[PDB]
Design a protein around this nucleic acid. Structure first.
Ligand SMILES: *O[C@H]1[C@@H](O)[C@H](n2ccc(=O)[nH]c2=O)O[C@@H]1COP(=O)(O)O
Ligand SMILES: [Mg+2]
Ligand SMILES: [Mg+2]
Ligand SMILES: [Mg+2]
Ligand SMILES: [Mg+2]
Ligand SMILES: [Mg+2]
Ligand SMILES: [Mg+2]
Ligand SMILES: [Mg+2]
Ligand SMILES: [Mg+2]
Ligand SMILES: [Mg+2]
Ligand SMILES: [Mg+2]
Ligand SMILES: [Mg+2]
Lengths: 252, 1635
RNA sequence: GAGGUAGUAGGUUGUAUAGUAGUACAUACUAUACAACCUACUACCUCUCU
């Protein structure tokens, strides 16, 4: 059935001849889809006539010839609209292949986008482009505060270092100054796997007294403060301040 | 705006007071100071331009820098004034004496130099704008100016000494000597302060909130705050003098104030912010010592937060705020609990107090469900720049804009702001206003307090212990602090701040003391409502007592209901300009008013009031008089409202109603079907055939008419398409032609041309000099012949189609005509006998004997038709004869391979043994099977020739015989038609179809020539039917220089306020006792909380019982009668103007001409070619269609409707004339007019396919099969009856109309035909002919002068219908010459019109057209808010006309181009050429900004930025801030065209001659290239990537951001005033960046 | 001659995004992307003609 139904009518009537009378009898000049209605005749003086209808003239003649032989026996933009809604570029389609016979070359149009690729095969390029675009269509329609948490993290980090010394600091009264705070801070820094670094400043203030800033690796890193008439009194004061700092961080 | 009128914008208020007298404008912002400065220079320059006087702007920022100051741009660009700002050591080049520069900006010592040299005279100067004088240095510099130039000149010679000093409240120094400094300043410069600005016009006119300066308590230091201050003061000592070896103080010092003022809980939540701001900013330390400082601060705040959390989270949220915070937040919580709609506006000092207050009220509003309605949003200030760190700046801008958009509409009420919320940001009117801080000065206090204007208004100021150092020392932790660690003066400051508060009330008393206008207090309006509300209300409809009235109070509420509902843009505040007045009558002070509704409004007179005893009863009564005259003049309807938009009813009789035909009317009313006037609904119309071609069959004996169908070949077909290479036969040389027999004389028709296999051939019809007397038996002869020609030859007969010789439709004869051998043409009777001799003769298959016998005849196959009789017997295909082939033979070489020679081929194919072997061959071809020869086969519609055949295929088909058609002669039968008669017979159907179409078009011409005298009746021949064929950096300067007057001003108005110049204690003591006694000072334990004749005599003291009578109230007409009697009996009523001289005089004292008109008398009307083209739809697939013609018809229709709507309805503003036009020009209306006037049955909508689109002559379709779905039965039954007799004898198979007799046509296409015929009548018979045709449809756009008939009128004045039952005609007169809009409500209106239009001669020398009625020019220039124009109206009525005039002018220019633009090209060389941007740029380029009068600030700033950015550009056409466009200047560009149109006695040569010189280089530039437009251009270049988001509102309150996005290409942004401007600039910047 | 493709070029109708002049949301002339369907020409093919 590679030949036209109009040519099928011509071949099945070439046994005697007969020029057929093809007239379009009727037309729906419709609002969105005008349709055509051809009417096929056969001789005008003795003793056949059929209807045919379709959207195009060629398909109308096809339906008319098919009816006479049996008696003898608008999308496309909508998928682009949806890819606009899903915020995509306009699709690009390319031609893949044909058949070496130029009267029966089934064109294949290759529609590739940034997401998927599909093929469209047809006897003409318009039906191939529809088939590729529709395959795109249902393929795309098948698949259309915290710093306080850091502070509490540091709190459970220092609670994880559960040495006796910190709860000893928490429980008893710490008015006593006779304890040597240097070994205390060394043991506490070893307890939470941290380290203490003293920076006694060679620069002096306006009272002539000595001072120091002492650094411990917190999360994020921190320092404490101290001063005294001597540098030894300065590091003792900063040591005591850091010890009571660790005591009150563990105090909860 | 009920009881107080609407206040003006404060800039024109200072402008009015400064025009009245000398002043010192005490206004803060520099830009509006520049606005008022520019304005008074302009108006008192208009006053100065009489004898020649200058007006200086002596200034202190001049004479040092070579650059020009900010007033140079203002007064050089946006005015017509020429300035000479003195350069640093100006040498005065050449003889350039200063009497020619209108403004003459100097320096003060320079002005002393000009005064002592007697070059600038101190008397011949009309204004002295000394710059800022709220500082010491400037006042000392200006001290020798006025200690030396007061005494010699009198105060008559002293000009206005306008001085743009700073804001009077935050200026100078001190508080006690403030009034003394102001009095000495006013006496120094010979002035009087008129400080009535936005600082004042928020507490005077608007709602006045009663403030409450509430005391909380002394914040007693509990042990928690004691330990917190102990550790913070421990850390203060180190960071005071910190150390470093080879920013932290501010966050360790200004956190303690949160502890002092708010408490420990807010200390935790405000060390939150500092902890984030330092932890984020400690990791970027380039040193190591500052890293340790920031670590110490951060871990101190960590310990602080931990201790505060352990305080009130482990030991135990309204109770926590109650117990563990300052009592100041308890006072705030009680204040917000006192409000059970609220728009609260809490303020602060810094930018971290706002955040902690936000978290305070968020947790209060959420944890405590009592105050559930508090939605909390905070907004801080901005300090950064786009120079560095754009990430933080953008994430702060996109948060601040969301916060202010949330507060903007209604979503979140409270807004805990900072100093950015005072100037700038536009916010809704508020309910509560809290100042958490005591105010810094009066600037913050009033710019914060002047925000709650609804009057349930409360403005609370929280007062507290003051600001001092709360530290102890440098010591370490105390014993109490360590115990807590191990275990766990209102009177002085409030006296000082109530002294500051009494000082603030004294400040506002001073400001109100310096005001010009004075207002009665609220006690007077209260006793007005109580006492005298017993007047007879003006009821328009008094019978139904729930309707309409104007009482005392409704009057003052209604005059500001009406004036605010007027046409006005964003820049204009339209208002009623009231005026108070006092006098003395009968010992009682009586008060007038005078009112002035806007000049935009049609109440163009002043409502001179009646003297009442108070001011506010006079106010209510003068508004009552205004509402009475308003309703009498027609502005008010039956419910005393202004008449709306759609409420305009046209008084002309042809207008209104517009009731439809019921087929159209029910589908308009129900609208379930597609609407009329649209292409979406189709309707099927009968294909009306010509009246000359129906019932014109000739009868035996009566003389009929013989029309030769003449053809003449013009352009033979070029041989590039001659692929078969056949000879070209002209049909002129053929002897056998064709004719038409018809009894009615065919009118003259245009000689159309067709395009056949021989090329272009021109078709005419001609009449014989003798007539045809038809004989008896020829009737059946031509009846047989016509059936033969149109049935067996051209195969045109369908089966629903049969020969009916006595028919109603398509009933003319066609005869075969022959040229006489001696010359001339006549009917071929012998050929008719030959044709009738053989009927439907099947071409017989002959035996061998005769072709054996006779030889070939060369003469028999000259012009032969040679069908093969050995196949296709019933309906053979007919072949031509192109050539004879003697060089071939039946034994010659076969083209193919499968057969031998032609004798062998015919022997073995059929059996036809060719007995004649010496016979030639016949080079033949088919005959035409597509009968439509109307289109050229080798041309496009655009003239582009189509590709002809390749030379290889041409020579293959012509030379190689595998192609081609070669046929033996003795095996073919000659048709009785020759080849020449066959080509004419094939070209007949298109000839008859075009003759029919021309006859319908001539029928329309005759119909309108009979209905209205538009054309000749019966007729020379027509014109033939055819088918037609460095800098960018400078731009940054012009984007920042304007903001220069912004930038410095902001800092200049928030910190300095400094520099003094060189009884009060009693007043402060009185105010302090009033504040402490009157409940304003809230103590810290007190929570926040007559008979008719007597009334008549006290109300009308200036007889009374005669006017009262026995009825109850008194009449307003009686009231004016008592006034008239009293002024008649008592001479004069000399009035004292209580606190306007601003306006006065009412309350005071032939290269394509476009209008070319042919003589319509004795005129043939349009040709039927152009009427056919107007009828020809674009679906015809013909070379003519209506589409290019509807674009000029539509533009002329819109033009003429607009001009008529201007002329008839002369008081109404054009916002309803637009509604009348939109009623009249809409395609529903033009549809129903067309279908009324039977046009749908006259059009072509289908491609002419003669086998399926044509009913041949003397044939008759039954018109029954198309609804139903023997031959003699079909004959006599289609004669008698249709349905009953027939019924006794791939979707919608019962489809509509057969194509032979009806066609489907959509509705908008008949509107298009109406407009196309307006275009055809326009082009042929002038604009007046199109006007009369527009009347003929039913849109009567002309006036009627019904005059008695001229006694068989004969001359026939065109545009005058056929007479009715009596002899009277309805002659349509021309358009009326309009009413000049010179409102003669002033006694010298021509002199005041010339006075207010001084200096426009530069404009008229620019344009070339000198106006004759210059009031048109002023009306075209006058903005809606140019309030001193008591002479004309605003321009909107003239813009409404000018844009339609320019629309038609552009369309008829682009229609006249030889380039022959499409509907699209001629549309888009208009759409991208009549635009607000191009109109504004041609306005700016030709100086329309320089001559546009307005009194609006925002429009002046927009005009500033645009004119500067254009004057940089040579006047050529992070969020991308592109320049806002002055739409007012585009409207001026249109309104000058409208004004020239009306001023020119309504012509279009003058408008186009003026506007060509402007728009012409855009005409050739945009005509050469392709213009487009930026939103459309970006949606065209990237067709469907581009999506536009919903617009967002910026934090500024008057900015819109659009955010264009191109997908996978970039996301872009632009900001602007409207949404159109912001969309345009964002798409424009994406257009420029995407390249 | 019928038919099947491919190229270009005139269109009509529909849908979607919109542009310009309006008016203060209808009104007019429209564009582009995309589609059907129509018509003029060209190049090559299967059949017929020859
Ligand atoms: O078969 C068509 C065509 O080949 C033939 N024809 C023959 C010779 C010539 O010079 N030109 C030409 O077109 O005529 C047949 C019908 O042609 P239309 O397309 O109907 O004009
Ligand atoms: Mg053909
Ligand atoms: Mg129109
Ligand atoms: Mg139209
Ligand atoms: Mg062919
Ligand atoms: Mg194309
Ligand atoms: Mg095209
Ligand atoms: Mg074409
Ligand atoms: Mg618009
Ligand atoms: Mg339209
Ligand atoms: Mg369109
Ligand atoms: Mg398109």
């Amino acid at each position: 059935a590679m030949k036209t139904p109009v040519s099928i009518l011509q071949e099945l009537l070439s046994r005697r001849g007969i020029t057929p009378g093809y007239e379009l009898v009727q037309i729906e000049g419709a609002i969105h889809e005008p349709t055509f209605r051809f009417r096929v005749s056969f001789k005008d003086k003795d003793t056949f006539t059929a209807m045919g209808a379709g959207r195009s003239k060629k398909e109308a003649k096809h339906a008319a010839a098919r009816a006479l032989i049996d008696k003898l026996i608008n999308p496309i933009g909508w998928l682009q609209e949806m890819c606009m809604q899903r915020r995509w570029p306009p699709p690009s389609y390319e031609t893949e292949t044909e058949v070496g016979l130029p009267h029966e070359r089934l064109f294949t149009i290759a529609c590739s986008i940034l997401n998927y690729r599909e093929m469209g095969k047809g006897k003409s390029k318009k039906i191939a482009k529809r088939l590729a675009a529709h395959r795109m269509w249902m393929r795309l329609q098948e698949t259309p505060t915290q710093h306080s948490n850091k502070v509490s993290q540091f709190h459970k980090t220092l609670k994880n270092a559960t040495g006796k010394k910190l709860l000893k600091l928490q429980k008893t009264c710490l008015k006593n100054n006779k304890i040597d705070y240097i070994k205390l801070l060394g043991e506490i820094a070893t307890e939470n796997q941290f380290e203490v670094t003293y920076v006694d400043i060679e620069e002096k203030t306006f009272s002539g007294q000595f001072q120091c800033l002492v650094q411990l690796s917190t999360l994020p890193v921190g320092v404490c403060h101290g001063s005294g008439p001597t540098a030894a009194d300065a590091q003792r004061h900063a040591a005591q301040n850091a010890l009571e700092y660790l005591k009150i961080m563990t105090k909860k | 705006h009920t009881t107080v009128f609407t206040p003006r914008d404060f800039q024109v208020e200072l402008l009015a007071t400064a025009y009245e007298r000398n002043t010192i404008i005490c206004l803060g912002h520099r830009s509006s100071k520049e606005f008022i400065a520019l304005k008074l220079l302009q108006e008192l320059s208009r006053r100065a331009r009489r004898h020649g006087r200058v007006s200086v702007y002596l200034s202190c920022e001049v004479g040092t820098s070579t650059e020009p100051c900010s007033i140079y741009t203002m007064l050089t660009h946006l005015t017509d004034l020429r300035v000479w700002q003195e350069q640093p050591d100006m040498q005065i080049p050449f003889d350039h004496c200063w009497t020619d520069y209108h403004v003459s900006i100097l320096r003060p010592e320079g002005f002393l130099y000009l005064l002592e040299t007697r070059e600038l005279l101190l008397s011949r100067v009309e204004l002295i704008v000394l710059e800022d004088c709220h500082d010491s240095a400037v006042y000392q510099r200006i001290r020798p100016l006025f200690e030396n130039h007061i005494m010699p000149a009198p105060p008559a010679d002293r000009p206005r000494i306008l001085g743009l000093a700073g804001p009077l409240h935050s200026a100078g120094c001190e508080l006690q000597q403030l009034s003394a400094m102001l009095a000495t300043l006013e006496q120094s410069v010979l002035c009087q302060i008129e400080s009535a600005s936005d600082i004042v016009t928020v507490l005077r006119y608007c709602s006045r909130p009663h403030e409450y300066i509430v005391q909380c308590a002394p914040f007693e230091m509990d042990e928690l705050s004691l330990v917190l201050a102990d550790v913070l003061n421990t850390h203060k000592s180190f960071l005071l003098d910190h150390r470093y070896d080879p920013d932290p103080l501010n966050v360790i010092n200004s956190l303690l104030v949160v502890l002092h003022e708010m408490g420990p809980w807010c200390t935790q939540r405000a060390a939150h912010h500092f902890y984030q701001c330092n932890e984020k900013l400690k990791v970027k330390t380039p040193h190591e010592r500052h890293y340790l400082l920031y670590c110490l601060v951060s871990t101190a705040l960590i310990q602080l937060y931990s201790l505060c959390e352990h305080a009130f989270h482990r030991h135990l949220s309204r109770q926590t705020i109650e117990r563990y915070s300052s009592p100041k937040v308890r006072r705030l919580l009680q204040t917000l609990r006192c409000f059970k709609t609220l728009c609260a506006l809490i303020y602060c000092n810094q930018n971290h107090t706002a955040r902690v207050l936000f978290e305070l009220l968020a947790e209060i509003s959420r944890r405590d469900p009592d105050l559930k309605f508090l939605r909390c949003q905070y907004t801080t200030d901005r300090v950064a720049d786009p120079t560095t760190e754009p990430k933080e700046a953008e994430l702060e801008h996109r948060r601040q804009e969301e916060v202010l958009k949330r507060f903007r509409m209604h979503d979140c009420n409270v807004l805990i702001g900072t100093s950015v919320l005072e100037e700038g940001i536009d916010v809704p009117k508020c309910n509560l206003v809290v100042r958490w801080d005591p105010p810094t000065t009066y600037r913050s206090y009033v710019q914060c307090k002047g925000r709650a204007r609804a009057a349930p208004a409360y403005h609370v100021i929280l007062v507290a212990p003051s600001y001092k150092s709360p530290t102890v020392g440098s010591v370490q932790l105390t014993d109490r602090s360590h115990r807590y660690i191990c275990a766990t003066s209102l009177a002085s400051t409030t006296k000082d701040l109530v002294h500051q508060m009494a000082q603030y009330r004294e400040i506002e008393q001073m400001l109100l003391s310096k005001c010009a206008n004075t207002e009665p207090p609220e006690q007077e309006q209260c006793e007005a409502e109580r006492f005298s509300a017993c007047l007879a209300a003006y009821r328009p409809k008094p019978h139904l007592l729930t309707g309409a009235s104007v009482d005392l109070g409704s009057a003052i509420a209604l005059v500001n209901k009406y004036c605010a509902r007027l046409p006005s843009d964003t820049f204009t505040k339209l208002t009623a300009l009231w005026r108070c007045t006092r006098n003395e009558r009968a010992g009682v002070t009586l008060f007038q008013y005078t009112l002035r509704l806007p000049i935009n409004s049609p109440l163009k007179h002043d409502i001179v009031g009646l003297p009442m005893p108070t001011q506010t009863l006079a106010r209510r009564l003068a508004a009552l008089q205004a509402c009475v005259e308003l309703h009498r003049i027609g502005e008010l309807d039956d419910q005393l409202q202004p008449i709306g938009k759609e409420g305009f009813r046209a008084l002309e009789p042809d207008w209104e109603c517009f009731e439809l035909e019921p087929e159209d009317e029910q589908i308009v009313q129900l609208s379930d079907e597609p609407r009329p006037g649209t292409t979406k609904r189709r309707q099927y119309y009968y294909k009306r055939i010509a009246s000359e071609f129906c019932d014109c069959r000739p009868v035996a004996g009566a003389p009929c008419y013989l029309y030769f169908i003449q053809l003449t070949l013009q352009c033979p077909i070029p041989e590039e398409q001659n692929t078969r290479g056949r000879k070209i036969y002209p049909p002129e040389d053929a002897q056998q032609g064709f004719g038409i027999l018809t009894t009615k004389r065919i009118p003259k028709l245009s000689a159309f041309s067709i395009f056949t296999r021989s090329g272009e051939v021109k078709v005419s019809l001609e009449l014989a000099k003798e007539r045809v007397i038809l004989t008896s038996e020829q009737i059946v002869c031509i009846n047989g012949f016509l059936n033969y020609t149109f049935t067996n030859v051209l195969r045109l007969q369908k089966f629903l189609m049969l020969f009916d010789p006595d028919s109603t439709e398509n009933c003319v004869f066609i005869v075969p005509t022959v040229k006489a051998p001696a010359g001339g043409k006549h009917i071929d009777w012998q050929f008719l006998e030959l044709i009738q001799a053989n009927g439907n003769t099947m071409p017989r298959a002959v035996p061998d004997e005769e072709r054996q016998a006779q030889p070939f005849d060369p003469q028999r196959f000259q012009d032969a038709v040679v069908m093969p009789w050995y196949r296709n017997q019933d309906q053979p295909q007919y072949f031509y004869v192109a050539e004879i082939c003697p060089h071939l033979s039946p034994l010659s070489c076969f083209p193919g391979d499968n057969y031998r020679t032609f004798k062998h081929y015919y022997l073995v194919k059929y059996g036809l043994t060719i007995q004649n072997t010496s016979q030639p061959l016949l080079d033949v071809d088919h005959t035409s099977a597509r009968l439509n020869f109307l289109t050229p086969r080798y041309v496009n519609r655009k003239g582009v020739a189509l590709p002809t055949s390749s030379e290889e295929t041409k020579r293959a088909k012509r030379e190689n015989l595998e192609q081609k058609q070669i046929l033996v002669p003795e095996l073919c039968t000659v048709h009785p038609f020759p080849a020449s008669l066959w080509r004419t017979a094939v070209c007949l159907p298109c000839i008859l179809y075009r003759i029919n179409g021309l006859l319908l078009a001539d029928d329309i011409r005759k119909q309108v020539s009979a209905d209205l005298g538009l054309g000749r009746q019966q007729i020379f021949e027509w014109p033939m039917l055819d088918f037609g064929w460095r800098q960018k950096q400078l731009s940054i300067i012009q984007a920042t220089n304007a903001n220069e007057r912004q930038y410095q001003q902001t800092k200049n108005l928030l910190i300095g306020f400094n520099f003094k110049h060189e009884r009060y204690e009693e007043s402060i003591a009185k105010l302090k006792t009033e504040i402490e006694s009157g409940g304003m000072l809230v103590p810290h334990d007190q929570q926040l909380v007559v008979s008719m004749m007597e009334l008549l005599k006290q109300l009308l003291p200036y007889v009374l019982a005669k006017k009262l009578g026995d009825r109850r109230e008194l009449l307003l007409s009686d009231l004016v009668e008592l006034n008239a009697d009293w002024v008649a009996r008592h001479e004069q009523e000399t009035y004292n103007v209580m606190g306007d001289s601003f306006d006065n005089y009412n309350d005071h004292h032939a290269g394509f001409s476009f209008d070319r008109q042919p003589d319509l008398v004795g005129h043939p009307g349009p040709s039927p070619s152009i009427i056919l083209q107007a009828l020809t739809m674009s679906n015809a697939n013909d070379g003519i269609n209506l589409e290019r013609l509807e674009t000029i018809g539509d533009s002329f229709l819109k033009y003429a409707i607009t001009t008529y709507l201007y002329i008839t309805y002369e008081n109404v503003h054009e916002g309803k004339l637009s509604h009348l036009r939109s009623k009249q020009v809409a395609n529903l209306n033009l549809y129903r007019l067309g279908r009324r006037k039977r046009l749908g049955e006259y059009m072509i909508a289908t491609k002419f396919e003669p086998h399926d689109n044509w009913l041949p002559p003397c044939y008759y379709v039954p018109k029954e099969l198309e609804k139903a779905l023997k031959l003699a039965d079909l004959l006599d039954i289609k004669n008698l009856s249709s349905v009953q007799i027939c019924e006794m004898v791939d979707f919608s198979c019962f489809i509509p109309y057969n194509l032979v007799s009806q066609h489907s046509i959509p509705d908008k296409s008949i509107a298009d035909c109406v407009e196309a015929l307006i275009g055809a009548y326009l082009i042929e018979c002038g604009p007046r002919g199109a006007l009369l045709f527009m009347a003929w449809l039913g849109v009567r756009v002309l006036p009627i002068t019904r005059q008695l008939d001229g006694g068989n009128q004969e001359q026939r004045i065109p545009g005058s219908t056929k007479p009715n039952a009596e002899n009277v005609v309805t002659v349509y007169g021309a358009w009326p010459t309009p009413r000049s809009p010179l409102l003669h409500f002033a006694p010298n209106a021509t002199e005041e019109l010339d006075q207010l239009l001084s200096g426009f001669e530069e404009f008229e020398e620019s344009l070339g057209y000198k106006f004759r009625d210059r009031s048109y020019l002023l009306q075209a220039m006058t903005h809606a808010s140019y309030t001193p124009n008591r002479l004309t109206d605003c321009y909107q009525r003239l813009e409404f006309l000018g844009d339609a005039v320019l629309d038609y002018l552009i369309t008829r220019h682009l229609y006249e181009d030889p380039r022959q633009h499409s509907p699209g090209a001629l549309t888009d060389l208009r759409s991208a050429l009549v635009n607000n941007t191009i109109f504004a740029s041609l306005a700016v380029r030709h100086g329309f900004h320089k001559f546009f009068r307005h009194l609006s600030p925002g429009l002046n700033d927009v005009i500033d930025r645009f004119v500067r950015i254009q004057q940089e550009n040579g006047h050529c056409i992070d969020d991308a801030e592109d320049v806002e466009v002055p739409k007012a200047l585009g409207d001026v560009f249109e309104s000058i065209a409208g004004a020239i149109f009306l001023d020119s006695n309504m012509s279009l040569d003058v408008v186009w001659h003026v506007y060509s010189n402007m728009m012409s280089p855009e005409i050739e530039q945009f005509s050469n290239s392709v213009p487009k437009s930026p939103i459309r251009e970006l949606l065209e270049l990237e067709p469907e990537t581009a999506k536009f988001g919903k617009p967002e509102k910026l934090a500024d309150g008057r900015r819109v951001r659009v955010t264009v996005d191109v997908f996978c290409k970039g996301t872009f942004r632009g900001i602007g005033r409207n949404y159109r401007i912001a969309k345009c600039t964002a798409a424009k910047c994406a257009l420029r960046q995407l390249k």
